[PDB]
């Protein structure tokens, strides 16, 4: 030996590893591994979790009669609020399972691990000496997860207001959220929608255009590695029917005539989009709701005329009253 | 560290009992004297300077003595703010008396326990 | 009283001619020597004027 520390540092920072294990990665594997082992055990076999603190539970496990679509990891009890609730603060194992302990374990380790993934990205890109900005493009789903799992709960006052980890659980969260805050008319959610449809659309456009122009591609290969001449043949003419549509829309909006603005714009669109909606979800965490119109049209007789906004307010009311077991005397509320 | 020089000391029970007897005798004072108006000035300031100095400690909220005298000082102060220049019913003087007695009993029974 | 209104009106129309006056006095390269004096005495006047309206505020 050379005294294990020197071997250990070479082992960690090696880029000849099949899977890079950096110094972020050294935190990342235990956290992500804990999160996933707890998740699959909980999803399969966590007994029903009381979620309103009235001793009426909800089953999310698969051995208690769910399928893939109806199952979930049920969030923490409403009694707990925002308290930190490790397993040694409970007094028995069965009551830690009855109050929804594991859910907090999963999300805390998951956010740590998914942050370290971004770190590990930045570090490896630093070793190969390339412009390290793949990480800022990833910071958009990461920002989104902070907003949905950590911040909206804090803003409302409890982790009982978090998103369940399950398929129908997400749908339940979405519907209830629209009921209490009117997300559709929030302009930031609109920026979000725009961003992901536009991302999908520009993905199809780019792909279709590129695969029509490529001709043949070959790069020299050796018996242990790769070559140093990347050959590539493409078509190099286009017509004036993609000059009134593509040419004088893109040269004018990109602010360049250069091809290097294509791939800069491709990533900018959805990233900005998902930041905007990630920001919006947090502003409703402090209850700044979106536009809603009731009684924006009245005639000069003094009778009200309805509009589409009022129909959506009716449907929202319908969802919202169904969500409320707690009392029938509630005038003005949340949080 | 560091208590006010307005009479108080660091040992709660002592300056508490003192403050209790002071304001007991103070509200026991006739209203046909022109010093009553003066009395309310020192009453109000010593209320504030006790409560704000002793509210800070977290331990003594697990006692009953502090929690009950708190209510007492609060009712006194609330009537003070409710009618500044008008004395208060003797219903509330009996109520104030009640919880002073029970606070005193509680201080003395927690001294040994 | 009359003198207090005279001051506040005078101050606001003074500040309003001065807000155009001071940048161009610095900006113009032609005859900076002559402009420096008037902006000096105007600044003096303007702070004096806010004092007198402020001191007559306590009587009005």
């Amino acid at each position: 030996s050379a005294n294990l520390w020197e071997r250990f540092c070479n082992w960690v920072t090696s880029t000849d590893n099949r899977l890079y294990v950096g110094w972020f990665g050294v935190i990342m594997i235990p956290t992500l591994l804990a999160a996933t082992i707890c998740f699959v055990i909980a999803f399969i076999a966590a007994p029903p979790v009381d979620i309103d603190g009235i001793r009426e539970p909800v089953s999310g496990s698969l051995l208690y009669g769910n399928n893939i679509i109806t199952g979930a990891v049920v969030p923490s009890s409403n009694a707990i609020g925002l308290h930190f609730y490790p397993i040694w603060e409970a007094a028995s194992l069965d009551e830690w399972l009855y109050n929804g302990g594991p859910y907090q374990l999963i999300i805390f380790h998951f956010l740590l691990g998914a942050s370290c993934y971004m770190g590990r990205q930045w570090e490896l890109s630093y070793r190969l000496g390339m412009r390290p900005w793949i990480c800022v493009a990833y910071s958009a789903p990461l920002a989104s997860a902070f907003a949905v799992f950590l911040i909206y709960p804090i803003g409302q006052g409890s982790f009982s207001d978090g998103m369940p980890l399950g398929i129908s659980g997400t749908f339940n969260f979405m519907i209830v959220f629209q009921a209490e805050h009117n997300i559709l008319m929030h302009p930031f959610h609109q920026l979000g929608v725009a961003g992901v449809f536009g991302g999908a659309l520009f993905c199809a456009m780019h792909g279709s255009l590129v695969t029509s122009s490529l001709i043949r591609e070959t790069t020299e290969t050796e018996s242990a590695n790769y070559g140093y001449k990347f050959g590539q043949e493409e078509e190099t003419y286009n017509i004036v029917a993609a000059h009134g549509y593509f040419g004088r829309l893109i040269f004018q909006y990109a602010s360049f005539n250069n091809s290097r603005s294509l791939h800069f714009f491709l990533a900018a669109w959805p990233v900005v989009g998902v930041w905007f909606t990630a920001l919006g979800i947090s502003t409703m965490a402090f209850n700044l709701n979106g536009f809603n119109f009731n009684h924006s049209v009245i005639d000069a007789k003094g009778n009200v005329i309805n509009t589409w906004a009022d129909i959506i307010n009716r449907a929202n009311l319908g969802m919202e009253v169904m969500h409320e077991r707690n009392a029938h005397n509630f005038p003005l509320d949340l949080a | 560290c560091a208590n006010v020089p307005t009479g108080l000391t660091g040992n709660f029970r002592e300056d508490t009992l003192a403050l209790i007897s002071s304001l007991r005798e103070a509200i026991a004072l006739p209203e046909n004297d022109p010093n009553k108006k003066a009395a309310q000035a020192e009453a109000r300031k010593k209320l504030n300077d006790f409560f704000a100095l002793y509210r800070r400690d977290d331990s003594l909220r697990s006692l009953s003595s502090f929690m009950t005298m708190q209510t007492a000082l609060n009712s006194l102060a609330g009537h003070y703010s409710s009618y500044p220049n008008r004395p208060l019913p003797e219903k509330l003087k009996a109520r104030l008396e009640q919880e002073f007695k029970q606070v005193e009993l509680a201080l003395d029974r927690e001294a040994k326990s | 009283t009359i003198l207090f209104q005279l001051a506040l009106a005078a101050l606001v129309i003074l500040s309003f001619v001065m807000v155009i006056g001071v940048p161009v006095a610095y900006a113009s390269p032609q005859d900076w020597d002559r402009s420096k004096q008037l902006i000096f005495l105007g600044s003096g006047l303007w702070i004096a004027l806010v004092l007198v309206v402020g001191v007559l505020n306590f009587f009005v």
Binding site: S282, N289, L332, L334 | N48, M67, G78 | -
Partner: protein, 432 residues
Amino acid sequence: RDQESSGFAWWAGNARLINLSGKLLGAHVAHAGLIVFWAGAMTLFELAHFIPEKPMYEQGLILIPHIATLGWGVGPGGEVVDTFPFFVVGVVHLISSAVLGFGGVYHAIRGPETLEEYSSFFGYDWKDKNKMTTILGFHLIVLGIGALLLVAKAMFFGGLYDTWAPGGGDVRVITNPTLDPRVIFGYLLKSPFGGEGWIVSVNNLEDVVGGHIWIGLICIAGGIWHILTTPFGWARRAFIWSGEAYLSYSLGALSMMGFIATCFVWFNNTVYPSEFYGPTGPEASQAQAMTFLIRDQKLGANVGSAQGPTGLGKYLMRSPTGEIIFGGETMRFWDFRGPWLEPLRGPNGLDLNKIKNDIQPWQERRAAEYMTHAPLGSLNSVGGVATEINSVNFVSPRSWLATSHFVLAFFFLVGHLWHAGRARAAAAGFEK
């Protein structure tokens, strides 16, 4: 010079000021005039629509509450007792902006481009460690003195608005903060999670003033150090030493101060009284339950001797630590503390007897008033949930404060990464 050929455009015209030290001083000092101008204008504009008998949060006041907490213009009970102090600060800011603006337009249209070949005492560069550490040292000492201004206002010029006095809150002069560091630095060892809170759990003005004593003196101490002490070897190898980097380092701190500012305004109640800002998040709900408990007990039958169709609690229930708290969807709240609620608690929490016969007038009216205007908001400033009709209008000023400062904090995180990458790219160089 004054046209392209320095490597930037006209939307990075600001970037032409990096080496032009006099113009750069000019831009900052003129910008500072704008901040003061906005303060003065907004305050006067807010006074002009203020009614001095209707509270400071159904109208949309956001900056006169800041004046009120310094004890200016409020008497005992949390009311307005004349609107004249608001006017004094309003026009004081407004006129000082003039002379700020005068010096700005002077240094940015006439003054020397280079302040290094004027004098060496206001000269600087972004590579000379000694000048820049002296500027930092001066800014530290003046900030430390500024912090001590609030212990002065709290001690000598008539106290601050104490929310925890027993009349319902009133102005009070602090004549004893606590300097025993075990409290002051103790808050920073709390966990941020519920049941305690981090430093957004502080709840008496004594810790506030005493912490200000400690921070003021330590800031002046560090400011005395950083004039007489040049940067050390390990330090000079750790960072980049360029001029845009310092702006990056600053941006990284302002990002964090934003998120904790939102926590401060949204949760805390002692350095943000609830009679000048609206009801807090938890306290609204708590008041609603307490008002209802009183109402349905004095008319009808008791409900803290009766369990409902819930199977645990009806109006009162036990916590996960066995403590009597409100029931409903408001059992997520039991850490809350307020000046109107504590006189109803015993050592075990709520005792229904106390709720029956220890109610004072201000408690009950304040609670029912708070209950009506729970913190809801929207961009068109329509009251209630975004299902309700135009029958009630309200947004809580706390909602606005929190949301805007959170949004800008995120954008400063983007800008921090932007200037960080800029600095690193410049300093490495790669072909240098």
